[PDB]
Design a protein around this nucleic acid. Structure first.
Lengths: 735, 94, 249, 716
RNA sequence: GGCCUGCU
RNA sequence: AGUAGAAACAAGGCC
């Protein structure tokens, strides 16, 4: 007899055992080298899906741009980006009519937010493409570098501390004859108008790793800092709009998505009488981002912001204006090998414009030949369409408009449709009195989608009777069925620290028990395995064992020293008291009454040199990138113990010409620590104002010395010493 | 910052001459009984043109006023000024 | 005394003097987050990879003057080589366990008073009474429920001023809290935590967690109470219901 | 008017007033009288505060110039002259230290004698109105208020004047100096009334310059300016434009539904080529175990001593010789490496105490076997351009290979029971709730079912091997290291036992990226002759190292005993994911527990015990030539565990792609079997998407064969 | 041969 | 050789 697990589906329905079809117990695919090939392929594919448009050359950037809008209507089922302006404007108008007051309200709240938003909001972001160094750097670092360059060039309106003023300075920089940047190898280099325009309109391309569910790798993009404020405002407007649309599912979580899917299916099927047939289409959109033209987003926003202050319209329109002229950096480059001479070489992507094509294979040779005409200063113009879901929410708005355009008031026919859209994925429930009606409805829905630059993937889509469908790895079969294979990768040690890892693991087990219908015995097994892996990872074994490690000696002496050994934490080699009933309690508090007072005091000592807290945002928040989803943050319950240390940093900056960044880091951190000691609320509430550091610090020294004498340790001798030391630092700052 | 010392006032006959000095724009003003303080000369009132001549030595910070063809109408307390700082005032009686 | 003294020492050197002079208060946050350290994409892989090194964690410089450089057999506990972009020094994990067996001891009696939420959870569970398990299909319907069982009927911003006035009374600014509920909360949490020396930031964070109301969407069947939702994993399942009554009731 | 503040006032005050001007964001060129008025207010604040000191008594000491001493206390300490944030900082600090009441508006000074605030304001109008005006602005105030006015008069409540009168003569002399100096200037046409409390501003975000031209190039094809396009949009109204283009659009743009029937789906085509080879990092079906029967636990013990003791338990060693060559390497190197390992093992046996971890010598043998100094040296392009052989890295579709029957048998025997327990679980909090007791009983049942399973043994082998390899790579980056493959089990009798499959030599492991490869050489004992399925051992070199005698009724077999030696490699990501193989247990048993719960939701009672003991119900878990064979729930547990283990062992992008694109077709087939009239828009596209994932991986090809068999058995 | 780094 | 698979590893750089 030959064993075959798949035959199990002959008795258990597919959805009731779908977890077996998710090989999420092995290493996910990773990219190894350059992503330049993928970037070039994506650029060429985006440009050839809109080949029948019209070509122009921008007078500012001098780059060739392709406009397919209002182009010839498609005559085949292949992907097409020839969106029609009038059709999309009409779709938005019908969306407004079905939801009166949506645009005006959303614009009002967006106007409030834009005129009260601060610059620091831009620091709350992941890697961004700093143009000062032409590389990806943390959002805060890139923002600081750009602000420094602007201030050095004379653009100091951002000193007002307002994001709108920062954007005003950004736009004013576009009209400058010559800017100056700094490079280390420090050298001051001058950038002319066109070079700075291209550096501000460019995107950095990388390869996406840890992407499960496809054989081929893809490319993703990261924009600069000049354009992120406009993107933030536009996405704020789009989120405020989608929050008023029940057909959208992008700005919500997973459980809300499931609830809305259940509600829509029940509404569609229940209202349908015996005569009407119902069919569900589990649709995926092929080349979703490559076929969405930024000009159409400009049209949608300018229709949304009608009868609004002109400044609001301008600030919200700046973003799509820059995306329509966006450029993409090709990537890291290409690495060649010569086996005859036994050597390797790494050529940067910027040489692709001039480098001969003898080194490249046929596929890459043709890709380079096709993309060369669009190469301007080492970057390729990508006007026709978006690169990687930067305007997720606006795309969801367009999809929701398409979904609502079939409310049976615009169809003008017996058939009708509804459903749920989340960018690149949708479920469409279509009802009609007969199979011919369903066919006509789906055909018209597809045709209308093709008029908006949205394509339906026929290969990854199928239609059945309502009651069974899929949506973003959520399988609905007369009710959503748990999978538990999507969350399997999150059952190990997170990698934050000991206490954080313990709390995160127990909380993940608890949550997957609540949401993903994890069984009790399975949860107990998960707890046991997690504890085993945790002890084997942090070298913290039970203590009563003879497992020799680098940490087994101190742990054993602590074990023999303690009297009530049941109170020792698993991190210190103690027994595990966790169970299904204790999954919502931190380890420290669960073992508090069992700890010896000496060990308890040594553990939770504020003066410990290991605990370090930076800001209110990073107290008990851990960023865990979930499998098959975007990066997410979790609140984990933990007590600040000596085990809450933060791990070592990379330390490879020491071998790079960018070595002075570490000295600047140290000096900035010293100044920030001094300010915090002067202003204790610096971390919890970020200080605001327009004065400089030393003014506030010296003046508060004055006052605090005064009052702490009026009652406290200070003495006249010390108070006068502080006053004249303040005068000394004053005259020092003078010179 | 500046202190002003006047000299050379006193009693003179109609048609006579008198020379004021001030040790420190700089100028001379006068105030007659029951009248407002009027400008005389700075370094010229229409009343004193061609009759009174002012001069300034910057080396010694001194502003001389030469008054010729004096009349009863020129009877006043004369004050030196510096740009505003004032001297104590010196009587001129014609 | 000290604080202004390292201030003067910083201003002595030209670079830090320039940083202090030209940098305005508003930019405080930016430069504080200014770092070359990228946020890790795969934390688990490197935590499993770094812990195999010697000196894998980081600690303040003060550790060099509280913990000896080596233990009884000579296993090194800390190194004097500083981190990449900080004055902290890289140290071995043993320096943690050492601190828990011979490090300085204090009076942790006030931690229960600080971490009110967690200890209240423990007390509620310790006095709970279980019941029979009933096996029947559960119709889990998704609903919006409040998870925090100690929220004082305050929002984030609404309680943020209360938290500042409780911890940072001088940086409150214009705000003087009007609602009398906030008055009593301030009085109680002021007299209760009058000398607690854990940290201002952690105290503020835990006060925010305790007082601020927070809500999330979850699949529930029955219950719906704040105390009954924290144990939702233990009382409700796919085909079984476990009757439970927390210690509070 | 600004010429006055150019002339008279000192710098300090003028820049203080200029920063106060910047504070609230209004411009100085439009209205300057406010600047002069508030700078005079600030000046009176200074001149009133300074020159006034106190000593330990009350009765302020007044000195025209502060002498060098600790006695420099200031009688009145200023509030204004600071930012709003700091003004409120001082207010709150004074309130919290003085125990006084917090005012709602900005004071100007604080004093000790009377322990309270002073709000100085000198207005153009007479005092006896401005005083009570600001008084009714401030609610129930105990802070004393004192104001002057240009005429020279002073006033205050309580008839209180807080310090010397010569200072106030100073104030009013300053005041009339101001007055009869504007007399020379002439400003009272507006000085009395120049500020009326104007607060208004319009936000301006103007597109101009280059950024405007970009806006003119981001419009539809037939538009010339953003102004015109916005006007058109504002004037646009729906007039049935979607219908017109829908009618005009070609009818070939359709989404016709192709019915999906029993005869529609065709079997997935498998690639053809040379048979598929073995890819695992260790032997799974052909492993052999040398044991000692020690009482130590899994992690307890020292590796090298245990390995040597286990190997000494076997007698019959022969001089090794080549049996099956690598066919691409230098087998004599493998032979010499094996003999070197034996020699150095003896060398450890001789000395005093077995080292916890041993380093081996870097001979040419393992230099070749571990691929040392073979990475091409990195150079610059400008120095290597004329080399004809210089080209890209080989980037093409992997070699095509057809499925072989060995993977099927390997999976078959990976789901079979064993004579040992390969899982020793940790401790948990004592169960207190009845649901916890049910969970514990279920868990005990599953552990009894799966512990005696080859899948669990493979899990432990992989976890231990990858953990040791990762730790050695991170610790001994430079020097080659010896690691014996160890796994500890427990017999039926209950006696604990150790097992030594072989050895692993780890090489240079300077791993920077998650994809960087660490090469090692693995040696494993076995009895399976490699002359029967050679195509499965394409990358192995197999020697003959001894003879084994296992008790059998046919005299005694005296079988040969071979050594499978190969060069393999891994990476940080692969090591990390292989050291988390225990979650296969989770996956499998979660699936089984979901089955049990779903069935128990029907009958209102827990159904675990009868499922595991009666074994009445069975699921299709394989096909025999007679037909489909069904097994008890325990066999399903073992089968799913083996499937998860093989997923973790043979993981690859092919597996992910095939899994997704075959789950799609499985859902379609399930819809067909449920009588839900399934339909497809392009089924050929889906088939081509599935078939492109099957290239050379044995596991994915076996999964595809299983899928074809399931289709054949289904659709009936 | 000596020393530096391992997400920069 | 080996790992791996649309491009890489099989140490890097600095003296």
């Amino acid at each position: 007899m030959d064993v075959n697990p798949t035959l199990l589906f002959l008795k258990v329905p597919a959805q009731n055992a779908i977890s077996t079809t998710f090989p999420y117990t092995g290493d996910p695919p990773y990219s190894h080298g350059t992503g330049t090939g993928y970037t070039m392929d994506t650029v060429n594919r985006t440009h050839q899906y809109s080949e029948k448009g019209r070509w122009t050359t921008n007078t500012e950037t001098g780059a060739p741009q392709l406009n397919p809008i209002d182009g010839p209507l498609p005559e085949d089922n292949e992907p097409s980006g020839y969106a029609q302006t009038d059709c999309v404007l009409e779709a938005m108008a019908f969306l407004e009519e079905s939801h009166p007051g949506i645009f005006e309200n959303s614009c009002l709240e967006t106007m409030e937010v834009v005129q009260q938003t601060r610059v620091d909001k831009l620091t709350q972001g992941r890697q961004t493409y700093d143009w000062t160094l032409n590389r990806n750097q943390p959002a805060a670092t890139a923002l600081a570098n750009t602000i420094e360059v602007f201030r050095s060039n004379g653009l100091t309106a951002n000193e007002s501390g307002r994001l709108i003023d920062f954007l005003k300075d950004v736009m004013e920089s576009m009209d400058k004859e010559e800017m100056e940047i700094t490079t280390h190898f420090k050298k001051k280099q001058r950038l002319n108008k066109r070079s700075y325009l291209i550096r501000a309109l460019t995107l950095n391309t990388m390869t996406k790793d840890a992407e499960r569910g496809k054989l081929k790798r893809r490319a993703i993009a990261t924009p600069g800092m000049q354009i992120r404020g406009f993107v933030y405002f536009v996405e704020t407007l789009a989120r405020s709009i989608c929050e008023k649309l029940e057909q959208s599912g992008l700005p919500v979580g997973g459980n809300e998505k499931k609830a809305k899917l259940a509600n829509v299916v029940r509404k569609m099927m229940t209202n349908s009488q015996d005569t009407e047939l119902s069919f569900t289409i589990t649709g995926d959109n092929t080349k979703w981002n490559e076929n969405q033209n930024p000009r159409m987003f400009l049209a949608m926003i300018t229709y949304i912001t009608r009868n609004q202050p002109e400044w609001f319209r301008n600030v919200l329109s700046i973003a799509p204006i820059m995306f329509s002229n966006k450029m993409a950096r090709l990537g890291k480059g290409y690495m060649f090998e010569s086996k005859s001479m036994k050597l390797r070489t790494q050529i940067p992507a910027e040489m692709l414009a001039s480098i001969d094509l003898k080194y490249f294979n046929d596929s890459t040779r043709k890709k380079i030949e096709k993309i060369r005409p669009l190469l301007i200063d080492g970057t390729a113009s990508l006007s026709p369409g978006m690169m990687m879901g930067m305007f997720n929410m606006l795309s969801t708005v367009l999809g929701v408009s398409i979904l609502n355009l079939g409310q049976k008031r615009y169809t003008k026919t017996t058939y009708w449709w509804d459903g749920l859209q989340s960018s690149d994925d949708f479920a469409l429930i279509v009802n009609a009195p007969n199979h011919e009606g369903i066919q006509a409805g789906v055909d018209r829905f597809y045709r209308t989608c093709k008029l908006l630059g949205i394509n339906m993937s026929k290969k990854k889509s199928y239609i059945n009777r309502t009651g069974t469908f899929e949506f973003t790895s959520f399988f609905y079969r007369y009710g959503f069925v748990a999978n538990f294979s999507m969350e399997l990768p999150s059952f190990g040690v997170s990698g934050i620290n000991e206490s954080a890892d313990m709390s995160i693991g127990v909380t993940v087990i608890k949550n997957n028990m609540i949401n993903n219908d994890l069984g009790p015995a399975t949860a107990q097994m998960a707890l046991q395995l997690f504890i085993k892996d945790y002890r084997y990872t942090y070298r913290c074994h039970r203590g009563d064992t003879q497992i020799q490690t680098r940490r087994s000696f101190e742990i054993k002496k602590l074990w023999e020293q303690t009297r009530s050994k049941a109170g020792l934490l698993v991190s210190d080699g103690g027994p595990n008291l966790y169970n299904i009933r204790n999954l919502h309690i931190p380890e420290v508090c669960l073992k508090w009454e069992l700890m010896d007072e000496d060990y308890q005091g040594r553990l939770c000592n504020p003066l410990n040199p290991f605990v370090s807290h930076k800001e209110i945002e990073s107290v008990n928040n851990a960023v865990m990138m979930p499998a098959h989803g975007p990066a997410k943050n979790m609140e984990y319950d933990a007590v600040a113990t000596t085990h809450s240390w933060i791990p070592k940093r990379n330390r490879s900056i020491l071998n790079t010409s960018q070595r002075g960044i570490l000295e600047d880091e140290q000096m900035y951190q010293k100044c920030c620590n001094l300010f915090e000691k002067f202003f204790p609320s610096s971390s919890y509430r970020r200080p605001v104002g327009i004065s400089s550091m030393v003014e506030a610090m010296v003046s508060r020294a004055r006052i605090d010395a005064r009052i702490d004498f009026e009652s406290g340790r200070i003495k006249k001798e010390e108070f006068a010493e502080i006053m004249k030391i303040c005068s000394t630092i004053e005259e020092l700052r003078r010179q | 910052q500046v202190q002003l010392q006047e000299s050379g006032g006193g009693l003179v006959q109609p048609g006579g001459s008198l020379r004021l000095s001030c040790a420190a724009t700089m100028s001379w003003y006068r105030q007659a009984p029951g009248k407002e303080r009027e400008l005389v000369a700075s370094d010229y009132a229409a009343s004193v043109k061609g009759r009174f001549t002012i001069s300034r030595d910057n080396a010694k910070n001194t502003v001389y006023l030469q008054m010729n063809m004096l009349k009863p109408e020129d009877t006043a307390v004369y004050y030196c000024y510096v740009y505003t700082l004032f001297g104590q005032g010196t009587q001129v009686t014609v | 005394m000290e604080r202004i003294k390292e201030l003067r020492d910083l201003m002595s050197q030209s670079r830090t003097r320039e940083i202090l002079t030209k940098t305005t208060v508003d930019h405080m946050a930016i430069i504080k987050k200014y770092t070359s350290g990228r946020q890790e994409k795969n934390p688990a892989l490197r935590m499993k990879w770094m812990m195999a090194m010697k000196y894998p964690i980081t600690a303040d410089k003060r550790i060099m003057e509280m913990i000896p450089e080596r233990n009884e057999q000579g296993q090194t506990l800390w190194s004097k080589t500083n981190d990449a972009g900080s004055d902290r020094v890289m140290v071995s994990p043993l320096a943690v366990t050492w601190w828990n067996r011979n490090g300085p001891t204090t009076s942790a009696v006030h931690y229960p008073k600080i971490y009110k939420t967690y200890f209240e959870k423990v007390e509620r569970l310790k006095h709970g009474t279980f019941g029979p398990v009933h096996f029947r299909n559960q119709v889990k319907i998704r609903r919006r429920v409040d998870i925090n069982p100690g929220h004082a009927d305050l929002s984030a911003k609404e309680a943020q001023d209360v938290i500042m006035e409780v911890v940072f009374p001088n940086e409150v600014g214009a705000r003087i809290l009007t609602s009398e509920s906030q008055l009593t909360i301030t009085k109680e949490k002021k007299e209760e935590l009058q000398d607690c020396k854990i940290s201002p930031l952690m105290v503020a964070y835990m006060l925010e967690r305790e007082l601020v109301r927070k809500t999330r969407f979850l699949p529930v069947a029955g219950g719906t109470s704040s105390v009954y939702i924290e144990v939702l994993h233990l009382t409700q399942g796919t085909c079984w219901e476990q009757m439970y009554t927390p210690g509070g009731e | 008017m600004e010429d006055f503040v150019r002339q008279c006032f000192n710098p300090m005050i003028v820049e203080l007033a200029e920063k106060a001007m910047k504070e609230y964001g209004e411009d100085l060129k439009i209205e300057t009288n406010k600047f002069a008025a508030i700078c005079t207010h600030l000046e009176v604040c200074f001149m009133y505060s300074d020159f006034h000191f106190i000593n330990e008594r009350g009765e302020s000491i007044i000195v025209e110039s502060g002498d060098p001493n600790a006695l420099l206390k200031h009688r009145f300490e200023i509030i204004e002259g600071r930012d709003r944030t700091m003004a409120w900082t001082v207010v709150n600090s004074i309130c919290n230290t003085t125990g006084a009441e917090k005012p709602k508006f900005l004071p100007d000074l604080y004093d000790y004698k009377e322990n309270r605030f002073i709000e100085i304001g000198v207005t153009r109008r007479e005092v006896h109105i401005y005083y009570l005006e600001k008084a009714n602005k401030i609610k129930s105030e105990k802070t004393h208020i004192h104001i002057f006015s240009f005429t020279g008069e002073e006033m205050a409540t309580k008839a209180d004047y807080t310090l010397d009168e010569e200072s106030r003569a100073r104030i009013k002399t300053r005041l009339f100096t101001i007055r009869q100096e504007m007399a020379s200037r002439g400003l009272w046409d507006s000085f009395r009334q120049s500020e009326r409390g104007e607060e208004t501003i319009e936000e301006r975000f103007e597109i101009t310059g280059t950024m405007r031209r970009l806006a003119d190039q981001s419009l539809p094809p037939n538009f010339s300016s953003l102004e015109n396009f916005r006007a058109y949009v504002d004037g646009f109204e729906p007039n049935g434009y979607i219908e017109g283009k829908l009618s005009q659009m070609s009818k070939e743009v359709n989404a016709r539904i192709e019915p999906f029937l029993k005869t529609t789906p065709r079997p997935l085509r498998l690639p053809d080529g040379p048979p598929c080879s073995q890819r695992s990092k260790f032997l799974l079906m052909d492993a052999l175990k040398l044991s000692i029967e020690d009482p130590s636990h899994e992690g307890e013990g020292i590796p090298l001593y245990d390995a040597i003791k286990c190997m000494r338990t076997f007698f019959g060693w022969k001089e090794p010789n080549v049996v099956k060559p690598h066919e691409k390497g230098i087998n004599p190197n493998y032979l010499l490496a094996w003999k070197q390992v034996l020699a150095e093992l003896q060398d450890i046996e001789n000395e005093e105490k077995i080292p916890k971890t041993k380093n081996m010598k870097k001979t040419s043998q393992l230099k070749w076997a571990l691929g040392e100094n073979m990475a091409p040296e990195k150079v610059d392009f400008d120095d290597c351009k004329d080399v004809s052989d210089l080209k890209q890295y080989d980037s093409d579709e992997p070699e095509l290979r057809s499925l072989a029957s060995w993977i099927q048998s390997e999976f078959n025997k990976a789901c079979e029971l064993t004579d040992s327990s390969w899982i020793e679980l940790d401790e948990i909090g004592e169960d207190v709730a009845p649901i916890e007791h049910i969970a514990s009983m279920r868990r005990n049942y599953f552990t009894a079912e799966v512990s005696h399973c080859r899948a669990t043994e493979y899990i432990m082998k992989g976890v231990y091997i990858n953990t040791a390899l990762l730790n050695a790579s991170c610790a001994a980056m430079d020097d080659f290291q010896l690691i014996p493959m160890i796994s500890k089990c427990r017999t039926k009798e209950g006696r604990r036992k150790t097992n030594l499959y072989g050895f692993i030599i780890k090489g240079r492991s300077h791993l920077r990226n998650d994809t960087d490869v660490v090469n090692f050489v693995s040696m494993e004992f076995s009895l399976t002759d490699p002359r029967l399925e050679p195509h499965k051992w394409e990358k192995y070199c197999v020697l003959e190292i001894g003879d084994m005698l296992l008790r059998s009724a046919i005299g005694q077999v005296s079988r040969p005993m071979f050594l499978y030696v190969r060069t393999n490699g891994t990476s940080k990501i692969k090591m990390k994911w292989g050291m988390e193989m225990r979650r296969c247990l989770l996956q499998s048993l979660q699936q089984i527990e979901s089955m049990i719960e779903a069935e128990s939701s029907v009958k209102e009672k827990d159904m675990t015990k009868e499922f595991f003991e009666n074994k009445s119900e069975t699921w299709p878990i394989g096909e025999s030539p007679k037909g489909v064979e069904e097994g008890s729930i325990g066999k399903v547990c073992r089968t799913l565990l083996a499937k998860s283990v093989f997923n973790s062992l043979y993981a690859s992008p092919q597996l992910e792609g095939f899994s997704a694109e075959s789950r799609k077709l499985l859902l379609i087939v399930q819809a067909l079997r449920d009588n839900l009239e399934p339909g497809t828009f392009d089924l050929g596209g889906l088939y081509e998407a599935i078939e492109e994932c099957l290239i050379n991986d044995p596991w994915v090809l076996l999964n595809a064969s299983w899928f074809n068999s399931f289709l054949t058995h289904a659709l009936r």
